[PDB]
Write a protein that binds this ligand. Sequence first.
Ligand SMILES: [Cl-]
Lengths: 289, 290
Amino acid sequence: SLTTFSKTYKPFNYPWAVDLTVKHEKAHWIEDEIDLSEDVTDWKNGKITKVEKEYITNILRLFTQSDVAVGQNYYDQFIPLFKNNEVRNMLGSFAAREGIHQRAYALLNDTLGLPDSEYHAFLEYKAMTDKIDFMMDADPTTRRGLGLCLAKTVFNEGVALFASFAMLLNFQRFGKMKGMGKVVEWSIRDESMHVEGNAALFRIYCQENPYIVDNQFKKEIYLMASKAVELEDKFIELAYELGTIEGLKADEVKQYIRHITDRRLNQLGLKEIYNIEKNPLTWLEWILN
Amino acid sequence: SSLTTFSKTYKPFNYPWAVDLTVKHEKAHWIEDEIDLSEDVTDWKNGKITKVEKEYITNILRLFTQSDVAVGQNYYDQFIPLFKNNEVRNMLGSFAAREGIHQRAYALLNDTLGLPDSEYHAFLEYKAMTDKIDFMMDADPTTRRGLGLCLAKTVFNEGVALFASFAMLLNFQRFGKMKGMGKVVEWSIRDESMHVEGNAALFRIYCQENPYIVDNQFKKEIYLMASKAVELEDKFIELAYELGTIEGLKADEVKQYIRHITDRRLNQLGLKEIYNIEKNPLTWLEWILN
Ligand SMILES: [Cl-]
C-alpha cells in the first residue's frame, strides 16, 4: 500500500510517482539564476506606476508573511504516513521545492528595496485563510481525515494565491517586471506538478481505503473548493480597493479562479460546479498549460 | 528561539548558516540523466574492464541498490519532525530530497550496465553487521539526549559508511575507466559532504542549546560510533579484497583512509581525533573530492 515501506527499489508500486518526480527534478531552478536587473530599472525609472507599485509591494508582503513554515503539510501530514519509497521521495521533492519559492520571494523583496513592515492590504485575506483552515480541523490521524487533508492541499497549491499570481503576471504580459514574472511562472509550473502528484495520490488513496469515500466526504471536498473561491474572491475585492490594473478587470479574475477551481475538482475525480468553459485570461494559458 | 520551534517570520534567521548551506546545496543540484554513461558501456563490453574489476563493480552496485531502500528515512522520521525551525527544516528537507537522486542514479547505473538482479552479493555480511549494529543501537530521537546521538550517528552514516566502496569505484576513473560511474560517485560525495557539514553544525548548535546532555558517557557513545564505523569499513575491505587486487590501491591504505576521514568527522562534531593520521593516505582521492 501507500503507507508501507518499500521492500526493494524496483519494481515500482506507483510508477507514476517516479515519473512525476523525475519530471519535477528536471524543472529544478534556483532564485539566484533569474535576471532581475531589468526589474530594478523598471522600478526606479517610472515605468511602474505608483498604483502598480502598491499592488506589487502589498502582494510580496503577503507572500513573505504567509506560509512561513515551508512544506508544513508535507512534513507533518503526508510524509510521516506515506512510507512507500517512490511516493515519499515525490513528496519530499515537492516539499524541498517550496523552499526555493520562499527564498525567491525574499530575494524579490530585497532586490526591489521593499521596506519591512508587518502591515499590508491583505491582512484580512491571511486571517480569513487561517480561519478557514481552523474550521476544517485537519486530522491526518484517521484514514478519512488524511484523505480530506490531501484534497485540501490540492486547493492550497492549485487555487490559493492564483488571483495574486495573475496580477503579478499582468506585468510580464506587457514586457514589464519580467524577472518577477519568471519567479511566478516557475512557481506555477512547480505547483502544477505538485497538484498533479497530490491529486493522483488522492485518487489512489481513495481506492486503497474505499470506505472513506462516503456521501459527506465528497460534499466536504466541494465545500473546500467553494471556500477556496470565496477566499480568492476576498483577495480580489481587497486588491481592487488599491486602484485599477491595466487590462485586467475584477470580474474576469473571479471567473478565472472559478475556472481553475473546476480543474482541481476534475483532477480529484469530482465534478465541475461553475462550468466556465474558457479561461477568460487567455494570455495566461501558456503559463497554466 | 530554538531548533525545535516554528519560525514566526522568515527573516531574520536564527541559523543563517543553514540557509547559506541550503543555497549552496541547491546550486549543486544534478540529475542522473545528465551524466554520459555511453563510454562506460563500451568500457564494460569491450574488455577494458577486467573480470575481477567487473566483480568489484557488480557486487558493490548490488550492495548499493539493496540497502538504504527507504530514502531519507532518518531525515523524514527522526530530524524533520522535531526540528521545526524553518531554515533548519528546509535544509534537512533539501538534503533528504537529494538522496532520492542518488538512489535513482545507482539504479540507472545498474540498468545501463545491464547488471542482472540476484539477491546474493559479496558484502552480505557487511550489510548484516551494519543492520545488526543499528538495530542493537536504540536510535531514540524522542529524548533530548538520544536526538543528539542520532545526529552524531547520521554524520558517520553519511560521512564514513560506504566510503571504502566509494574509493574503489573512484579508482577506475583514475585510469580513464568507468568515468560516468565516477561522476555519479563524485557528485554523490559532494552532496554527502554538504549533508555532513550541515548535520555536524546542527549537532554542535544542538549541544549548545541542550548543554546538559554533553557528559562523559555521551561522548563515549559517540567515540564508539566512530570506532564501529571504522570496524564496519574494515570488514567491507576484507571482503572486497577477497575478490582480487585493485591496480594502484592497497587494502591497508584504504583502511588508513577510512581512519583519516573518521577523524575528520569527529573534529566536525567538535570532538578529538583518535587515529591521528596526519596526511590523507589517498592523495588522488582527496583531489577529486576537491
Ligand atoms: Cl481511521
